Amino acid sequence: NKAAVVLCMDVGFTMSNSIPGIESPFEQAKKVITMFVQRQVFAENKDEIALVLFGTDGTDNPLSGGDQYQNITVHRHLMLPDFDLLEDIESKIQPGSQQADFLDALIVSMDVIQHETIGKKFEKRHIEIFTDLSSRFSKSQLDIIIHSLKKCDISLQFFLPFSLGGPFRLGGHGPSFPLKGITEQQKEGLEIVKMVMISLEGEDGLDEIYSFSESLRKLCVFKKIERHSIHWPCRLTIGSNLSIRIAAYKSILQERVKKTWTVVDAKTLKKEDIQKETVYCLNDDDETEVLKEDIIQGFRYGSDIVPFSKVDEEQMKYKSEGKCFSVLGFCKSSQVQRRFFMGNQVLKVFAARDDEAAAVALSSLIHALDDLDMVAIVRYAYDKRANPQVGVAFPHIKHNYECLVYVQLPFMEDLRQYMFSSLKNSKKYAPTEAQLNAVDALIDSMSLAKKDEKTDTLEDLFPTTKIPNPRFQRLFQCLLHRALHPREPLPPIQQHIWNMLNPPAEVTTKSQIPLSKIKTLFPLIEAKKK
Amino acid sequence: GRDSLIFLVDASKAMFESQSEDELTPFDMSIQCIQSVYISKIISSDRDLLAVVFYGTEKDKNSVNFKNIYVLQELDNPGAKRILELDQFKGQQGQKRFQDMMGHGSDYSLSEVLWVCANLFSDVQFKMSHKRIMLFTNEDNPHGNDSAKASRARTKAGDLRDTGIFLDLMHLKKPGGFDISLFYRDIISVHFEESSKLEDLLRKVRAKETRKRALSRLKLKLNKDIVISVGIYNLVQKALKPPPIKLYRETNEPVKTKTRTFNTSTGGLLLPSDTKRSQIYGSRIILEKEETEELKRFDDPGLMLMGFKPLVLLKKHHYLRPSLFVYPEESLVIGSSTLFSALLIKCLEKEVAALCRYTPRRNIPPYFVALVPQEEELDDQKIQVTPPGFQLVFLPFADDKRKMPFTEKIMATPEQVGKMKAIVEKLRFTYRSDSFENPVLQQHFRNLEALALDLMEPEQAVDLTLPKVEAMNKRLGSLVDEFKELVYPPDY
DNA sequence: TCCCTCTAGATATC
DNA sequence: CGATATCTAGAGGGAT
Numbered sequence A: 001n002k003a004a005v006v007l008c009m010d011v012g013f014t015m016s017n018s019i020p021g022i023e024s025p026f027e028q029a030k031k032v033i034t035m036f037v038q039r040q041v042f043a044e045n046k047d048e049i050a051l052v053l054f055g056t057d058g059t060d061n062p063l064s065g066g067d068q069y070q071n072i073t074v075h076r077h078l079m080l081p082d083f084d085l086l087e088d089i090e091s092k093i094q095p096g097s098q099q100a101d102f103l104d105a106l107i108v109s110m111d112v113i114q115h116e117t118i119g120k121k122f123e124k125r126h127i128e129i130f131t132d133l134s135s136r137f138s139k140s141q142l143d144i145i146i147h148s149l150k151k152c153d154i155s156l157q158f159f160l161p162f163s164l165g166g167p168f169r170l171g172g173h174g175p176s177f178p179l180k181g182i183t184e185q186q187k188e189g190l191e192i193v194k195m196v197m198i199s200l201e202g203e204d205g206l207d208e209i210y211s212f213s214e215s216l217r218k219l220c221v222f223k224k225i226e227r228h229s230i231h232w233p234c235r236l237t238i239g240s241n242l243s244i245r246i247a248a249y250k251s252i253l254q255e256r257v258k259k260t261w262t263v264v265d266a267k268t269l270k271k272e273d274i275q276k277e278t279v280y281c282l283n284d285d286d287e288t289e290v291l292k293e294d295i296i297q298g299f300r301y302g303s304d305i306v307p308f309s310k311v312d313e314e315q316m317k318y319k320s321e322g323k324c325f326s327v328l329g330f331c332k333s334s335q336v337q338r339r340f341f342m343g344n345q346v347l348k349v350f351a352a353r354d355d356e357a358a359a360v361a362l363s364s365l366i367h368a369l370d371d372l373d374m375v376a377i378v379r380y381a382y383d384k385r386a387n388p389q390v391g392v393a394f395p396h397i398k399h400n401y402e403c404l405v406y407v408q409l410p411f412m413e414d415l416r417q418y419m420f421s422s423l424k425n426s427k428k429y430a431p432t433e434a435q436l437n438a439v440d441a442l443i444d445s446m447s448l449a450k451k452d453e454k455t456d457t458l459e460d461l462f463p464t465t466k467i468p469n470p471r472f473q474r475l476f477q478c479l480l481h482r483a484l485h486p487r488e489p490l491p492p493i494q495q496h497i498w499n500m501l502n503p504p505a506e507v508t509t510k511s512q513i514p515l516s517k518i519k520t521l522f523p524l525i526e527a528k529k530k
Numbered sequence B: 001g002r003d004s005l006i007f008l009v010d011a012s013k014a015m016f017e018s019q020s021e022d023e024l025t026p027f028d029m030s031i032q033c034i035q036s037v038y039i040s041k042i043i044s045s046d047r048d049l050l051a052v053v054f055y056g057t058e059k060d061k062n063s064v065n066f067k068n069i070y071v072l073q074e075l076d077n078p079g080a081k082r083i084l085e086l087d088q089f090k091g092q093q094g095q096k097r098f099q100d101m102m103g104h105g106s107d108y109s110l111s112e113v114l115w116v117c118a119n120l121f122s123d124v125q126f127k128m129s130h131k132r133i134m135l136f137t138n139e140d141n142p143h144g145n146d147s148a149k150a151s152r153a154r155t156k157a158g159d160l161r162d163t164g165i166f167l168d169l170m171h172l173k174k175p176g177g178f179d180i181s182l183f184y185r186d187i188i189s190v191h192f193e194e195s196s197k198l199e200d201l202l203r204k205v206r207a208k209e210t211r212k213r214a215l216s217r218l219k220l221k222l223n224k225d226i227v228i229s230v231g232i233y234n235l236v237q238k239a240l241k242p243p244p245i246k247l248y249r250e251t252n253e254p255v256k257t258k259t260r261t262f263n264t265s266t267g268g269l270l271l272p273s274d275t276k277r278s279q280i281y282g283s284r285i286i287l288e289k290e291e292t293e294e295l296k297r298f299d300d301p302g303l304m305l306m307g308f309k310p311l312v313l314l315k316k317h318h319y320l321r322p323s324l325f326v327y328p329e330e331s332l333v334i335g336s337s338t339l340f341s342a343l344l345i346k347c348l349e350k351e352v353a354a355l356c357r358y359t360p361r362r363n364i365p366p367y368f369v370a371l372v373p374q375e376e377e378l379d380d381q382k383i384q385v386t387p388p389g390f391q392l393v394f395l396p397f398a399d400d401k402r403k404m405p406f407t408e409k410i411m412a413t414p415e416q417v418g419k420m421k422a423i424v425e426k427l428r429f430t431y432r433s434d435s436f437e438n439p440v441l442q443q444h445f446r447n448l449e450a451l452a453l454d455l456m457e458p459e460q461a462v463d464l465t466l467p468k469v470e471a472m473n474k475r476l477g478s479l480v481d482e483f484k485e486l487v488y489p490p491d492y
Numbered sequence C: 001t002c003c004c005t006c007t008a009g010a011t012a013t014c
Numbered sequence D: 001c002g003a004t005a006t007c008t009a010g011a012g013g014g015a016t
């Protein structure tokens, strides 16, 4: 169904303290909240969003009785997000001049979750706190806070101006605030949130504490909100006497814009005014209109045109048995190169839910395939109407689960045998020693990974697979700008998008000299003829 | 424009000898190869022009009435009737019919053969792009006893090359070996080896008949200044069932279709500037076409180099869409090939992949791709199995990856893993990229063949993708029972 | 001019 | 049992 999310944002006086050259924590938190609400609104999710601000000049919460929980305001209650919330976030919300306990704000958010969810059903209750932890706070309510979070099944996430684990660029890769450059109050707040997140879920609590710049280039805000995919039940058959009940999920599937652009009149802005239609005419000269009743579909077989009615086509089309996941045979993993992978999806195949025997059988098959370094060539058909496919199911073993990964393999008609001239045995295009040395230096300098910690672990300096698609955020920004400012032109791409789409500045700085050497060693002239 | 291919098959007395071998004679070899080429052209709906000419025969048929030259098919698009006429010569009975109606073993001169080929090439009144002749013969010195004939053939090959057509020879198996350098070195335009298997000759033909059409000629930008030009090719492209064409009911010619848009009230035609694009969220957004395109624009088309990443960081299970191939294009930027070769050599040596931002065309969001360095590898027949260059691997974004429900990891005992190892080893088989055909396309084109030739019952295709259930059951023996005993409970 | 990609719309099936 | 997914069908940019 849906989930209830409460956003607890710090608007205190210290949140506006802007170090020169770096955006203030208030602005970064506003950007993160704006991105979250934009995705929730323009994807038309049914999730419920509430906004709680602590540190405001005023006080508006259902706990103020007794001069308690002061300077905490519930800006928006649990309801479907709309453009009013986005407009309020962008302009209406202003930083305050007071200071509020972030634990008291967490209590207020928990109360909002507990009270406003009565009646409605929510699979997940999530609270996200945006703060800098640079304010005095009390620890008397900690134990009951943890108890209420655990017993009410409420998730938690924390966003801070500084990361937990040169020039600073918002949304960049690698720069972070100096951990020794934070105040003692910030250190105490960090210790307290660390202990809270240890209590809530364990060692992953550190993994669930993010920074504004880091979160701007990740989907961590929606991590506790994403709905799981639907399994595809089938049986993995090896022959006719061996069958294993399996469930398949789409691990990789390209995301597309669900909403579609509707063509409307430029004056009335109505779809019904415009109407399109197709009229058929003879392709030769003196074109005459051809009525629908004179139209019969056909097919091209070489130079011959073959009439073929739809009923006949469905009668004598290829018919498959139906659902199937059948092993054709096992081949060495070296014979299946990844350059032949086809299709537009990747399936991870698990055993059937709550099936110990199926789990044992699939684990046996996976471990046998892994030990012998073999893969399974399988025939895959989604249903009775889908075209059968041939693919490879190779083992994928992790510390928490095991599965088979299915990627479709090509047919004979899908291959194209082009002839390309060799580059090694070319006397005209053979680079000299100096050119090879220059390219070696460039490759060394422009490296995107390092062997840090001396533990033989490769650190990725540019993990692009964790970066969200910039098109969605850009489209959401443009749509929001058009909705709020109809008369203004579209805004330029946000700077943090470019920062997250570019390699770290250290790589660019290192690549200066080798690139100049390459330019002076490789002559490149554009052609003017042909 | 169009490009045309002429198949030139030798009908000499030595082409019908099996050489005490169980495999097909070289004549049947060539006939089946030409048939497979015709079928492949029809499947892909290619606009190629194909012709089949036999030389060394008794009976002759051509425009110039040259002796011992017979043109079975002129330059025209392939069709069902042509494939049937070619099948007439297939097999032992087909060879017999070929001898009866055709003749063999007569004397010939190559100069007249290439003259007839040139006349056939000039006969077609079409936009001719490239003209090619494939010569099927197992004779390495056709004119070893006639120096004048050899000189005339060499001169004809020379001025035919100067005309602008290509002439590649596909030598077949001959006892004692085939020597290209003997007489055919100076005629054809390293080289492949002899043909001893049908799919060998098929691959050798397809490696030359097919022409590379670049998907896009982009620019690989190392930085703002160092820019080289590369071509993008799709080495794998999912074959699609051809769309149907609407036809007139009685006359069956294709009918042109066009779309006209108007206003439902006035009825007059409206320009694209007379409409806008709209989206409704809740109870709410008007955008122009130009704005809808502009919001999708990030970078100029091309590849922008971000850095080099070790190959161990590219997960095999992160596949997103079929990969592309990157090769230098010296036509656009002079000196691109040298830099491309140096980059390929150094990337192969260091086992790193170039990470780039990929923009296919204007007004499209960028995608991160990895240029995996790939080295040329040849076959024992000198067939280029893998071209040299970079493989463009698409990297998924965070949105493309999908989280999945978790379960407790249940491990298997070593005995069960051993039984599964035995089962896997029993069903071991060698996999090749062309081991399977598309059942849907095969059945569709079988039905089309039956309808075109007015056959009452179409030939039923054999599904090679279906597992050999009986064969695999026999091969596995009783291992399945032991595996079920060790894994499955008695009640299940 | 045609191929490939993108984007809409339809729909039988689990 | 209906919402998800797959096959199928129309425009647009670019190499030829």
Ligand SMILES: O=P(O)(O)O[C@H]1[C@H](OP(=O)(O)O)[C@@H](OP(=O)(O)O)[C@H](OP(=O)(O)O)[C@@H](OP(=O)(O)O)[C@H]1OP(=O)(O)O
Pocket (backbone or CB within 6 Å): A398, A463, A465, A466, B315, B317, B401, B403, B404
């Ligand atoms: O950066 P990577 O080396 O590619 O690691 C990824 C990443 O996880 P970690 O960085 O925490 O290890 C994926 O999750 P994201 O952080 O990108 O959201 C995770 O996905 P799943 O475990 O959910 O599948 C994936 O795992 P897998 O290989 O099963 O796809 C895992 O890969 P590795 O653990 O092998 O590094």
